[PDB]
Symmetry: T
Subunit: 148 residues, 12 copies
Amino acid sequence: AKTNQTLVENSLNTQLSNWFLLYSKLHRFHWYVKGPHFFTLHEKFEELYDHAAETVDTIAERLLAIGGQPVATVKEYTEHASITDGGNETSASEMVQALVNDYKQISSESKFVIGLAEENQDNATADLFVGLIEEVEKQVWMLSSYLG
Amino acid sequence: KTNQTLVENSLNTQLSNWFLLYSKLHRFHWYVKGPHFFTLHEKFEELYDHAAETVDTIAERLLAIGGQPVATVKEYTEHASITDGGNETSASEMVQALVNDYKQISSESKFVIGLAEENQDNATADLFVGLIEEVEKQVWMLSSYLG
Amino acid sequence: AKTNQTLVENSLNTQLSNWFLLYSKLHRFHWYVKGPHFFTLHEKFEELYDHAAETVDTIAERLLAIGGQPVATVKEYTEHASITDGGNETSASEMVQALVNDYKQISSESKFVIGLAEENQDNATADLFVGLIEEVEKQVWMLSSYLG
Amino acid sequence: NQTLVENSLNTQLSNWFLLYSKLHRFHWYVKGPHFFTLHEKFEELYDHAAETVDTIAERLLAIGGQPVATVKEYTEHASITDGGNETSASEMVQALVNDYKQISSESKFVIGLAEENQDNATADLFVGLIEEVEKQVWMLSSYLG
Amino acid sequence: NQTLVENSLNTQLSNWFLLYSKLHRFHWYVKGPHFFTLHEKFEELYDHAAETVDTIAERLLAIGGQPVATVKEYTEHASITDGGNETSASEMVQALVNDYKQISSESKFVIGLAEENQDNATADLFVGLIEEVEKQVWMLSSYLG
Amino acid sequence: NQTLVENSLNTQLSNWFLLYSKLHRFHWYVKGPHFFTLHEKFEELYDHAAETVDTIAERLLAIGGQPVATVKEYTEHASITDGGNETSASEMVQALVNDYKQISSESKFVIGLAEENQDNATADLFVGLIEEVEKQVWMLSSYLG
Amino acid sequence: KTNQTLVENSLNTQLSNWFLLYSKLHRFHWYVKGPHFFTLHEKFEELYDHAAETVDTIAERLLAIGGQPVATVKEYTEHASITDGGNETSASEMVQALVNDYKQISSESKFVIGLAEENQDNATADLFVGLIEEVEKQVWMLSSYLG
Amino acid sequence: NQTLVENSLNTQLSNWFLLYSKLHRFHWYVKGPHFFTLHEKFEELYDHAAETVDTIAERLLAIGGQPVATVKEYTEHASITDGGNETSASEMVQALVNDYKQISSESKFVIGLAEENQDNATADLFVGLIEEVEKQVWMLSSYLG
Amino acid sequence: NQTLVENSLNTQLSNWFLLYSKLHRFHWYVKGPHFFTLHEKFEELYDHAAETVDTIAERLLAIGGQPVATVKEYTEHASITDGGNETSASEMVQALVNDYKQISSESKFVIGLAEENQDNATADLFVGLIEEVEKQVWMLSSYLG
Amino acid sequence: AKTNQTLVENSLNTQLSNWFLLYSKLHRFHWYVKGPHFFTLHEKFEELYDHAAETVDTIAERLLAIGGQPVATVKEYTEHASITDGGNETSASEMVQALVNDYKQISSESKFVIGLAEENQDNATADLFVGLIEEVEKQVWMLSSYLG
Amino acid sequence: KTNQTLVENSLNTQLSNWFLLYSKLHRFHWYVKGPHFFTLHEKFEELYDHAAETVDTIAERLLAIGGQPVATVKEYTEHASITDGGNETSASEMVQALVNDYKQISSESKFVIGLAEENQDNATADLFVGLIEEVEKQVWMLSSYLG
Amino acid sequence: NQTLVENSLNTQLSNWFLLYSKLHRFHWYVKGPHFFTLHEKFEELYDHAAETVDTIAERLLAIGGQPVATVKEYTEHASITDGGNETSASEMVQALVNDYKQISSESKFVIGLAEENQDNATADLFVGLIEEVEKQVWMLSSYLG
């Protein structure tokens, strides 16, 4: 009950941390992408980081609204995330693949947050993450199509 | 009484709550005073604009499911679980009245989802899920103001 | 003098109450109108209630600006208005007729407020209600034309 | 479970493309004194139908399916038709009511299938749809009232 | 060939100004349960008539002619009238159908004169006008159907 | 009292339609190095005139009157004319000054009639008008200065 | 002295008041401090934008009626019934200065209507009627802030 | 002459609806490193195809004809197909080049029939369509070059 | 027939680029009390010239031709020049009247060649250009009148 | 050093005062311009006063940001400016010439402020006035061209 | 070490400072409380929007001059001269933290101009000149709030 | 000092007009699968080039100079050319890199000249330019990477 609530809050802090580190990674890809798909991917990556920033603010405000305490420092993001903004990507295909890998991991982990939220009778927290899955699975299809 | 009628009746109570809230927010918009006047006068208008949208959305959902929305001030008064009455005078008193009404609206909206779900009405539950998200955000903001 | 002022304030509270109850009635008509003029009248009624809401805020703020105390609860609106949001309208023509009846009553009563305001040397309060008469008499002509 | 979901999306995709078609027929052939209102309303509805076509196809693709994508396949996979012999404004509006009512029952069945397959995002898409279609069923039924 | 074209433009400029006038009369006097639709439609149509007036006059100027520009001249040069005793909604709409059809056939003669004078640009102006009026004729005729 | 008000609105309605006409003549025929400025200013003024035409007619209707609505009636009920033989930019601008000056005196007389008939809303419409016309009289007189 | 000249002269005083008010509002915009800084810094800009519009409207009406608007800072100083000077330091002092000047402007604008009406100039009276409405609204808002 | 024009418009209306369909198939199935560019381009092109469908149908109506308006009729009256086995990006783009070129030459025949019936306005519609499709042909051919 | 059309488009593309250049010279050097009006007008006109350059070139591409695309080629293929010794406002405006009139008559020859090659779409491009330039000729000539 | 700072602050107060008096002058020209260039110059003068108002606010806020105290009364503007809003202009050419004269004086004086700002190692204050010179020298060229 | 490398390295420190500032401003946006909640919650978002624009501008300038921007949170932490850490709780504490970081950023940006100028890189200096203008404005506004 | 500044602006003005020209050649002739991206990017760049042309000319005028204003003078005063025989997308992009790199070195030299003549505003204009060109050099070099 109190444990159910704490499990939900902790899971939101992990996802908040993932989305902040993804916003960071997307800057790295925006800045270092090269080759003849430069214009397309430089722009796409900025669109994606704008969406990541929105998501950061949406998760943190939902956590606050349920009585929790969002993590809010880069050291905390690094300690609580299940992903990293690091990596050794150089080519356009490696960058696009890296994003497919992070968005697939976020989709699976968001499904686990829905289960926790539902177990705590928190339909609004569940609904937030259902909407996220929709958006990230769309981008996995587009990014996977780029690579096909 | 019926699974259907229980859903319709619960939508009429919430329709009534949101209209009475629109009313109370006008009273606060008009009588708020002190050095947070500008901020709160404006915030209360933004909130009543949201309340008016919510009134139309709930009534239109009720119609879509075959019900009959209440649609006079006498009926809103008789069907609501909150009131537009009160003797709030200070900015803090007004903000705290809103926290109380939004908290009530959130708990009852969670009960609506349960009724709707039991009547296999996922679309009605979803409207209330969305309202819970917006109201609990406002509860956080207004409680922060008082903190 | 003080009586002149109190008569003006009381008259504004009656009109504020009328316009709030009209905003309510217009919702009822928006929701329950039927027949082949549904799209036209559903939309028209929303336009009209948007205007009623504006008018509510304009009268209440003028009352405040002259040192008065607007009524601000539905119980007060019901006790101070000269009209009602109630009624037994079912057809599109009955709904449109009901509005012609309320807008004509508001126009006559607003002319009486101009006389009171002028007697108290309150030109700005008079000007508010002159502008209202213009708008409501336009709508009476359009709504009466629908019914002709 | 997964194949049943995919197949159900292709039926609904097909229904929405055939409704887009039927709405053009009514937009073009409506007549009588409610011409202006209904010619415009039918265009609004087909714009919504087109958006719904793209959203369902793109969800199907994101879950690893293959959207049907020819008029022959739509005809074959749909549970409605774009045919009929409606002539008056009321016949046209009543035909829309019937199709939207059918789509809404079928969409509730899709939600159950998706939920049983633990696919909450696919289910959410059909929930939203039901909201919009049942609004239109109320509005169109009210016109006939 | 050139003075024929110029005189033919003056007659059409006159027609469009008189139509602008008639469309105000219908906007103001239309009644009955299609009031909102027709009051608004008649405004949209007069806005189009005023744009057309300015485009004809300015093409006449551009070819070296002298557009008529007083109501006495418009009455004197037009082939339609702004007069009439229309009262019902149907009478007003039927009156517009009549005028627009006369405007189309006469604009086809302007095209032929223009083409005979190797004035493609004037012809093109009127081709576009015919496209617009015949659409309005279909719409208004559909209202009456 | 009421009939005198109605008749006075029909005169002013007529004046404004004939000014709309005269402004098109000046828009089309202005020449010399102030062409661009004045061709554009005359269009702005006729857009305002058209709006004033619709506002006066709709007020007349709201008070239970019957707006005149043909160019023959405008000619007959107006206190100005759309005729004249202005040729230079200054002649055109001076003719506008004269008409706007006349309209403004006549509008003050309308306000007295309306006030005597206890019609404050009709009176308000002409007050607003006077504000706008006297602005234009200052601007046009300054051009001539 | 004349019915006409009395109207023209009263418009020059009000033109001058509104320009000096535009000036004072800049001083407040620039020097306001304390925790209502953001709200008041912004409000004072909105108010000076309105004052600038009002200056142009009054001058253009004066021109339209055949008068000559004053149009230098020396003349504004000499014709105004208010000043842009003052030693206001606190937010409350600045807001109260504005309430005082707006109240004065409203009472004198009512006197203008009377002069204009006596010269059968309804259009000039109407401009001032509209100004009274806007200023008295602001007086309510600013007084509420101090309440 | 008139029934030939009408039948020729039905065939083109059919072609544009089938192209709208094919463009959805390519939007959904395109893959490889030009995905973002082509997915978006194919949407822009289908938006244009839908506008074209409505403009043809409404011109057919305006001349007194009866537009086809079911997918069975479009299949029955069209000269292209929405079928095909395109998989690669190049195959899809080449397929669009083929269809647009067929649409251009056939639209040139519509122009000649229209002109023979003194229907300049219908001809003009198709002249504008040829301008747009041949630009797209150049662009798409350039992609393949 | 086809190589004649292509060469004729190159000459017009060249003319529009050189006009763009000349219009910059006039924008920069115009003086006297019509400065604000003419400085701005000359910018509006060069914006139109740049749009025209791109539309001609892209039509040439669309028909299978090779647009010229260096200033040495524009000088070599044009029938006007961007040179000249215009100093006064009147000289600059008169120079534009001269160029626009030459552009119109030459565009009428392009229309005839295009029509002889059954290229309606190219012809239509130039018909629209003539409409625009002759309006500008009237406006600029009016300035000088 | 402290003297360097005080010289910069005083120079900004003189320019703030110039720009306020120019805003005033531009109203006078907007209201009293006459002749056949009326429409053009009435509009141009309003555009210019809108720019002067912006400049007023920009200089005053820069002065505040460097620790100074902007003058903020018309009496102070009159005492600190190097220009006046007064004058005996009647014709359109005299008005346009008067503005050329003030904008040329402002450009020269702004160059002197750049020298003072640079001597105090204040690059941002210098940059503000470089941007002003660009704009005012553009208008001197246009206004001088009107008169050529 | 080189005139070029000194410029590149100084841009990486400032890039890092602006990203960590974007972070701190989120923490303040989320935890600010008390009666200035609405004003400050909104102000802090406007400031982080500006910080994000600044991050992209500095990184893109560094790239244009042939450098390599740092682009992970570990590197931002190691290269910055400020931190996103802190225990600020009150509105005044948060506003004062911002004044401190903006003042630091302004002084170091002046040092960058000097390095850039010594490497004949006027375009890099100009980017920093513009940042100084915006930051010192904010320092005035935030200090006024505390006054 | 002053004459050296003026002469240097005329060289840079010329460079920017010739780059505007070269960007149209590449916009029109680019081919291969990066067609859509590069056809659009080249148009964005020529819009920027046109704005840069007007800004440099207007600065030159404000300092009392005389901008060159014919294609013959641009050819003669420029340090680059709009000629060349680029054919592939990479050749086109590499040619842009070379021109932007050259413009940027030359603009730094202009800044020194302007500073030595105590002209900080002219110097500022070239600083801003360097910022924008070096951005494009990074983006274009990255495409080639």
